[PDB]
């Protein structure tokens, strides 16, 4: 009677403590339906200035609809706390399963890895990076299905921008994360997944040490032991996933193509697969119908005229995706008739403009060059500027971001990046023309 | 609307009394360390106290209000924004907060700094125009670019007074790598 | 009937644009010689023109501009073509247009019907797709791209009665006043036939009468790549010698062959036209993508 109740759920034992907040089991007062309630303290969020991160985290978890990602049912707001009512899974952490059995058998390990990678790929396609992938953050249900959960250290990846924030346990963190360097995002999640696959199959970590500076040297070295009980196929997949070089590191497409990963793989886990279009609802396809005819089209699908409209886009999308050579260029058969012979040679392209002088001297030359060309800038960092120039013909402002980078011990680089938010002119021409003025002056 | 009353402090027996229950002692259930109660309360100011181990006390982390006689009661304002998540997050964001474009150069450091610029990410060195197409396909076609290389400027070395600039830009779910030849 | 016409109206231009493609743009103040060399180094045929003073896209620079410059200004193999060496894009356009032609373009939101109608009316091959919101040129739309797109959706709709009909029955293409070139025809003469007749290719005929090769407007750009544009006295055979190795022959079609097979042969070959022939391998005329798309969509 005097129990703590949020909604119609009675709060029980603490399931654990996440990156942000506390998680408690919830049991429905009338039915006994079980949920997991993540309690976020409003003052703790304010004290840490994590208001923006919490906002983006809720937005994504509400949008997310994947069988291998923990569902968020509702968020109950109170004057002191935020109560995130989520899907409950009885099997607990994957970490505890690995410890109980010593090591997971190849068949079950692959099945679980295929489910984890399916969830990771869903996040990446929705421009979200987990950045805290470990078996502790991978939960199991009653039917032994994997579900990724703590999106506290997650972030959204935008066009042209990089991520730096040092997130996750050192044992699962990529060499670039440890080094405190800028990274794209997805390659960091693939490293963590490689460590999970090693831990599933071996029941041990590929890089482990009591002394932290030695552990960091081990990860940066990328040298790990491959046990004799693992076949060469899985070994190559692990070696491609755990590459020190992020450019040489495996992509989700590379893993999907691997002979070991392909075995007994369900045809509904990944997009473009034979059962994905027939069993998985496409958000972008439903949104395209909304502008033509906003209401829910679920009743017609679960044959009505409204349902055919959804499937027409899905069919047309498949035809365009099947003709791979028509929309994208192949990796380097008769040559294309329009292939042009070589001139007469072979000039190489480069990012922005390079300088071997001191970084303070480079920046000083930038401020002078801008002032002569009547530019207006904002100093967000000592090496990061937000420049603006009004176009005289179109009467519109042209915006670009300047960033100074370190190439080597003596070399530096000035990066130019356009900012998009011109009817008479052209946006791309405005960026090129603003860059040209600054390049010629410098 | 649900309102949380949590006792972070220690104790064996904790009670809650306020303006909402005519200052009567309500027993709080304990977990491992917390003593909590979730009550449905209307919008407005609410005064409350805590009765721990036979002694009157208050939460120091919550706002303090002293009456005409001298009794200390915690005050909590139940607002309309506190019921909806996105409205509550909007109030929390503006609470943390509590410029223009210029032609003035920034100083080297607040205090003298030898701090180096960030190390160039290797992804930007993957030049789309330096890569070979494969002969079978249309010469206009290019591979799918990394989202991270988008909007970045790429250039050729100035030859015979003409400069060449390129960049990869997005249009909906498609990418265009425009090249511009203009005299310097 | 009229199935393909309804298909064109429903599909926007955006659906044709590749996922990733390159676009070469020239400033109108750029020297015309550097511009044609840039088309070669970047492997493109056409390029939109940006007038930095007007802050607008004013036109397109194609291989037709190169053909026109050469035929107008070539004098001898002994003397250099001064205008080709010193003319800027803007100065060339002033003498070429004398006819102040506005920029013929299409929006990515406009239907394929509007793009095909624009390509036919204006008698053009390359139509720039420009976003009205950003003002950016996204893609150069052609007859090849449009026809190849339809080929992917042929199974998606019922095939009309005209697709099963013979080319002789439908009468699609030109079968009179066919502009041709001899095996020994000098390049300069072949360029004159291009300017006068406004056709994209000239079939090459030997002394016996047989069609050995085909000289297209595209082949003219090899004069810039090999830097052999200064000697236009050489034969068409000598100008096509660079591609003698790895050349199957002149892609032809028969008058008895169905419209479906002509479309499939053209799409697979990624070529603009086929030379039609009768039951005997006798040249009866030509059938290009402009003829095909006019019959399929416009009518
Ligand atoms: C680690 C942490 C995370 C969040 C946090 O903020 C909150 N913790 C909370 N705990 C509770 C809470 C919920 C249920 C119960 C409870 C009471 C009786 C039986 C079972 C229960 O779960 C105890 C405390 C509530 Cl209602 C709000 C909270 N807000 C405080 C802490 C913290 O202990 O510093
Ligand atoms: N060599 C040629 N001689 C005569 N007519 C042609 C030739 N090439 C193309 N045509 C016709 O000219 C029109 C436009 O040609 P095209 O430039 O190939 O699109 C079409 O109606 C063709 O049938
Ligand atoms: N009917 C044809 N038979 C053989 N080659 C062709 C034919 N039409 C065009 N070509 C070649 O294909 C290339 C592309 O030209 P076009 O078809 O005009 O876009 C040129 O190098 C032509 O020489």
Nearest to C37 among A315, A323, A343 (CB): A343
The three-class DSSP label of residue C34 is helix
DSSP character for C235?
B
What count of Cα atoms within 13 Å lies in the side-chain half-sphere of residue C98?
A: 1
Cβ contact C221:C66 at 8 Å: yes
Cβ contact A193:A116 at 8 Å: yes
Contacts of A345 (CB under 8 A, 6+ apart): none
Phi then psi dihedrals of residue A286, to 5 deg: -70, -40
The three-class DSSP label of residue C242 is helix
The answer to whether residue C25 neighbours chain A at the CB level (below 8 Å) is: yes
- For B98, counting Cβ atoms within 10 Å of its Cβ (0-12 exposed, 13-18 middle, 19+ buried), the class is exposed
Helices (H) and strands (E) in chain B, counts: 1, 12
Strands C201-205 and C181-182: parallel
Of C117, C105, C104, C103, the closest CA to residue C9 belongs to C117
Q: Where are the alpha helices (DSSP H) in C103-186?
A: 112-121, 143-152, 167-170
Contacts of A61 (CB under 8 A, 6+ apart): A72, A84, A151
Of B120, B122, B126, the closest CA to residue B168 belongs to B126
Cβ contact C214:C250 at 8 Å: yes
Residue C281 Cα to ligand 3 middle (Å)? 19
- Which atom of ligand 2 is nearest to C202's Cα? 1
Q: What is the separation of C-alpha A115 from the centre of its chain, rounded to a whole number of angstroms?
A: 16
Residue A373 Cα to ligand 2 middle (Å)? 51
Q: The sheet that has B35-40: what strands, in order across it?
A: B2-7, B35-40, B29-30
The three-class DSSP label of residue A206 is coil
Matching residue, tokens 């009866």: C284
Phi then psi dihedrals of residue C193, to 5 deg: -70, -30
* Token pair listed for A149: 């959960």
Concatenate the DSSP letters of all residues of C165-183 into one string. Answer: SBHHHHT-SB-SS---EET
Phi then psi dihedrals of residue C239, to 5 deg: -75, -25
Tell me if residue A132 is catalytic: yes
Are residues B13 and B94 both part of a single domain? yes
Strands A5-6 and B55-57: unpaired
Strands C47-51 and C20-27: parallel
- For A231, counting Cβ atoms within 10 Å of its Cβ (0-12 exposed, 13-18 middle, 19+ buried), the class is exposed
Phi then psi dihedrals of residue B30, to 5 deg: -105, 145
Concatenate the DSSP letters of all residues of A345-361 into one string. Answer: --PPPEESEEE-S-HHH
Cβ contact C273:C286 at 8 Å: yes
- For A289, counting Cβ atoms within 10 Å of its Cβ (0-12 exposed, 13-18 middle, 19+ buried), the class is middle
| Long-range contact set of residues B85-90: C-beta below 8 Å, sequence gap at least 24 | B85/A58, B85/A75, B85/A77, B85/A82, B86/A55, B87/A77, B88/A42, B88/A77, B88/A82, B89/A51, B89/A54, B89/A55, B89/A58
Q: What is the separation of C-alpha B7 from the centre of its chain, rounded to a whole number of angstroms?
A: 27
The CA-to-CA distance between both ends of chain A, in Å, stands at 76
The three-class DSSP label of residue A34 is strand
* Token pair listed for A346: 């072979």
- Return residues 114-133 of B near C (CB < 8 Å): 129, 133
Measured distance CA(C274)–CA(C288) in Å, rounded: 6
CATH code, domain carrying A201: 1.10.510.10
Strands C201-205 and B154-155: unpaired
Cα separations in angstroms, A202 against A91, B148, C286: 21, 35, 69
Measured distance CA(C6)–CA(A405) in Å, rounded: 54
Cα separations in angstroms, C33 against B30, B50, C36, C47, C224: 85, 88, 5, 14, 9
Cβ count within 10 A of residue A23: 19
Q: Which of A13, A49, A132, A421 is catalytic?
A: A132
CA angle C65, C69, C71 (to 5 degrees): 115
DSSP character for B33?
S
Our answer on whether the CB atom of C201 is closer than 6 Å to any ligand 3 atom is yes
Q: Experimentally, how was this structure solved?
A: X-ray
Nearest to A426 among C45, C135, C148 (CB): C135
Are residues B78 and B120 both part of a single domain? no
b/e sequence B104-136, b meaning 16+ C-beta within 10 Å = eebeeeeeeeeeebbebbbbbeeebbeeebbee
Element (H, E) at C58: strand C56-61
b/e sequence A375-412, b meaning 16+ C-beta within 10 Å = bbbeeeebbebbbbbebeebebebbbbbbbbbbeeeeb
Q: Strand locations in chain C, DSSP E?
A: 20-27, 47-51, 56-61, 126-130, 137-142, 181-182, 201-205, 211-216, 252-254, 273-277, 283-288
Please give the resolution of this entry in Å, rounded to 1 decimal. 2.8
Q: Which domain holds residue B123?
A: 113-184
Rg over CA atoms, chain C = 20
Cβ contact A70:A148 at 8 Å: yes
Cβ contact B96:A51 at 8 Å: yes
Q: The sheet that has A146-148: what strands, in order across it?
A: A92-93, A138-140, A146-148
Measured distance CA(A126)–CA(A189) in Å, rounded: 14
Matching residue, tokens 């013929």: C104
Measured distance CA(B101)–CA(A396) in Å, rounded: 15
Cβ contact C155:C251 at 8 Å: no
Measured distance CA(B181)–CA(C211) in Å, rounded: 40
Cβ contact A206:A215 at 8 Å: no
Residue at a domain's end among B50, B74, B99: B99
Phi then psi dihedrals of residue B15, to 5 deg: -125, 155
The three-class DSSP label of residue A145 is coil
Domain annotation covers residue B108: no
Domain annotation covers residue B107: no
Measured distance CA(A94)–CA(A143) in Å, rounded: 13
Cβ contact B156:A164 at 8 Å: no
Residue C100 annotated as binding site: no
Provide the β-strand partners of residue B86.
none
Q: What is the separation of C-alpha C129 from the centre of its chain, rounded to a whole number of angstroms?
A: 17
Partners of residue A177 in chain B, C-beta under 8 Å: none
Q: The sheet that has C211-216: what strands, in order across it?
A: C181-182, C201-205, C211-216
Measured distance CA(A324)–CA(C18) in Å, rounded: 10
Cβ contact C201:C216 at 8 Å: yes
- Return residues 145-184 of C near A (CB < 8 Å): 148-149, 152-153, 156
What count of Cα atoms within 13 Å lies in the side-chain half-sphere of residue A389?
A: 24
Contacts of A130 (CB under 8 A, 6+ apart): A120, A123, A137, A148, A151, A153, A154, A189, A192
Concatenate the DSSP letters of all residues of A56-90 into one string. Answer: HHHHHHHH---TTB--EEEEEE-SSEEEEEEE--T
Q: Which domain holds residue C278?
A: 1-299
Count chain A–chain C contacts defined by CB atoms under 8 A.
90
Measured distance CA(A411)–CA(A353) in Å, rounded: 11
The answer to whether residue B80 neighbours chain A at the CB level (below 8 Å) is: no
Are residues B77 and B2 both part of a single domain? yes
CB-CB under 8 Å, C40 with A340: yes
Are residues B133 and B58 both part of a single domain? no
Measured distance CA(A290)–CA(A286) in Å, rounded: 6
Q: Where are the alpha helices (DSSP H) in B53-178?
A: 85-97
* Token pair listed for A378: 């904002």
Measured distance CA(A48)–CA(A213) in Å, rounded: 28
Domain count for chain B, please give it. 2
Measured distance CA(C49)–CA(B180) in Å, rounded: 10
Q: What is the separation of C-alpha A281 from the centre of its chain, rounded to a whole number of angstroms?
A: 21
Measured distance CA(B182)–CA(B169) in Å, rounded: 19
The three-class DSSP label of residue B36 is strand
Q: Which domain holds residue A195?
A: 92-258
Which of B171, B172, B173, B184 would you mutate first to test chain C, the one with the most C CBs within 10 A?
A: B171
Cβ count within 10 A of residue B157: 10
Of C26, C136, C25, C140, the closest CA to residue B171 belongs to C136
Measured distance CA(A130)–CA(A174) in Å, rounded: 13
Cβ contact C10:C111 at 8 Å: yes
Measured distance CA(B137)–CA(C274) in Å, rounded: 21
Q: Strand locations in B44-141, DSSP E?
A: 44-52, 55-57, 64-66, 72-78
Cβ contact A65:B106 at 8 Å: no
Measured distance CA(B58)–CA(A236) in Å, rounded: 62
Dihedral sign from CA coordinates of A104, A105, A106, A109: negative
């Amino acid at each position: 009677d005097g129990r703590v109740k949020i909604g119609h759920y009675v709060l029980g034992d603490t399931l654990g403590v996440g990156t942000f907040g506390k998680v408690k089991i919830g049991e429905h007062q009338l039915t006994g339906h079980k949920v997991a309630v993540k309690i976020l303290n409003r003052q703790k969020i304010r004290s840490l200035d994590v208001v923006g991160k919490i906002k983006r985290e809720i937005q994504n978890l509400k949008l997310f609809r994947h069988p291998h990602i923990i569902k968020l049912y509702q968020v109950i707001s109170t004057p002191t706390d935020f109560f995130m009512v989520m899907e409950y899974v009885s099997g607990g952490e994957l970490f505890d399963y690995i410890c109980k059995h010593g090591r997971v058998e190849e068949m079950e390990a692959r099945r679980l890895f295929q489910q984890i990678l399916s969830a990771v790929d869903y996040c990446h396609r929705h421009m979200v990076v987990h950045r805290d992938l470990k078996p502790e953050n991978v939960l199991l249900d009653a039917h032994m299905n994997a579900k990724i959960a703590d999106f506290g250290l997650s972030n959204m990846m935008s066009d042209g921008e990089f991520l730096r924030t040092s997130c996750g346990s050192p044992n699962y963190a990529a060499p670039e994360v440890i080094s405190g360097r800028l990274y794209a995002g997805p390659e960091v999640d693939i490293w963590s997944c490689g460590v999970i696959l090693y831990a599933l199959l071996c029941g041990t970590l590929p890089f482990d040490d009591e002394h932290v500076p030695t552990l960091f040297k081990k990860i940066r070295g990328g040298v790990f032991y491959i046990p004799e009980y693992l076949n060469r196929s899985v070994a190559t997949l692990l070696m491609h996933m755990l590459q020190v070089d992020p450019l040489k590191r495996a992509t989700i497409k590379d893993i999907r193509e691997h002979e070991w990963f392909k075995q007994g793989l369900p045809s509904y886990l990944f997009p473009e697969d034979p059962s994905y279009d027939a069993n998985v609802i496409d958000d972008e396809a439903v949104k395209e119908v909304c502008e033509k005819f906003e209401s829910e089209v679920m009743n017609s699908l679960y044959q009505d005229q409204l349902a055919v409209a959804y499937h027409l886009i899905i069919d047309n999308r498949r035809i365009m995706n099947q003709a791979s050579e028509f929309y994208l260029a192949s990796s380097p058969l008769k040559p294309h008739p329009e292939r042009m012979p070589p001139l007469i040679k072979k000039a190489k392209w480069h990012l922005g403009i390079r300088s071997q002088s001191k970084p303070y001297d480079i920046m000083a030359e930038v401020y002078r060059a801008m002032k002569q060309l009547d530019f207006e800038w904002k100093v967000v960092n000592a090496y990061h500027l937000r420049v603006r120039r009004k176009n005289p013909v179109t009467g519109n402002y042209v915006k670009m971001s300047l960033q100074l980078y370190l190439v080597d011990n003596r070399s530096y680089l000035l990066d130019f990046k356009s900012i998009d938010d011109p009817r008479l002119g052209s946006h791309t021409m405005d960026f090129f023309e603003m860059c040209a003025s600054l390049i010629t002056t410098l | 609307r649900p309102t949380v009353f949590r006792w972070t402090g220690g104790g064996k027996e904790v009670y809650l009394s306020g303006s909402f229950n005519n200052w009567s002692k309500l027993p709080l259930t304990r977990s491992h360390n917390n003593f909590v109660a979730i009550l449905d309360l209307p919008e407005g100011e609410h005064q409350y106290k805590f009765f721990v181990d036979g002694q009157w006390t208050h939460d120091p982390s919550e706002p303090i209000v002293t009456s005409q006689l001298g009794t200390v009661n915690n005050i909590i304002q139940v607002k309309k924004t506190d019921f909806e998540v996105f409205d509550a997050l909007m109030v929390d964001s503006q609470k943390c907060s509590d410029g223009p474009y210029h032609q003035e150069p920034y100083v080297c450091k607040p205090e003298e700094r030898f701090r180096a610029p960030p190390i160039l990410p290797p992804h930007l060195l993957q030049v789309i125009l330096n890569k070979d197409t494969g002969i079978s396909c249309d010469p206009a076609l290019l591979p799918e670019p990394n989202h991270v290389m988008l909007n970045h400027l790429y250039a050729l070395s100035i030859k015979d007074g003409v400069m060449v600039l390129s960049a990869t830009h997005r249009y909906k779910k498609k990418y265009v790598t425009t090249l511009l030849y203009k005299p310097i | 009937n009229s199935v393909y016409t309804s298909f064109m109206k429903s599909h926007r231009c955006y659906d044709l644009i590749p996922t990733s493609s390159k676009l070469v743009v020239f400033d109108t103040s750029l020297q015309v010689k550097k511009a044609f060399f840039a088309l070669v180094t970047n492997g493109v045929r056409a390029a939109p023109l940006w007038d930095s003073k007007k802050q607008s896209f004013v036109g397109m620079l194609t291989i037709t501009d190169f053909i026109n410059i050469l035929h107008r200004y070539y004098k001898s193999a002994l003397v250099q073509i001064y205008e080709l060496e010193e003319h800027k894009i803007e100065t060339w356009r002033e003498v070429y247009l004398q006819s102040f032609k506005p920029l013929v373009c299409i929006s990515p939101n406009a239907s394929l019907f509007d793009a095909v109608s624009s390509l036919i009316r204006n008698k053009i091959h390359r139509l720039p797709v420009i976003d009205p919101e950003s003002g950016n040129t996204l893609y150069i739309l052609t007859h090849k791209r449009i026809l190849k797109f339809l080929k992917l959706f042929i199974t998606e709709f019922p095939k009309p009665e005209f697709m099963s009909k013979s080319l002789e029955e439908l009468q699609i293409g030109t079968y009179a006043n066919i502009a041709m070139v001899r095996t020994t025809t000098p390049v300069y003469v072949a360029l004159g036939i291009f300017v006068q007749h406004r056709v994209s290719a000239l079939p090459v005929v030997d002394e016996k009468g047989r069609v050995v090769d085909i000289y297209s407007k595209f082949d003219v750009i090899n004069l810039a790549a090999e830097k052999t544009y200064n000697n236009l006295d050489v034969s068409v055979t000598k100008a096509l010698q660079h591609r003698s190795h790895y050349f199957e022959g002149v892609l032809k079609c028969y008058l008895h062959e169905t419209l479906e097979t002509i479309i499939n042969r053209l799409v697979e070959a990624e070529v603009h036209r086929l030379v039609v022939v009768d039951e005997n391998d006798v040249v009866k005329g030509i059938v290009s993508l402009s003829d095909i798309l006019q019959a399929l969509v416009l009518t």
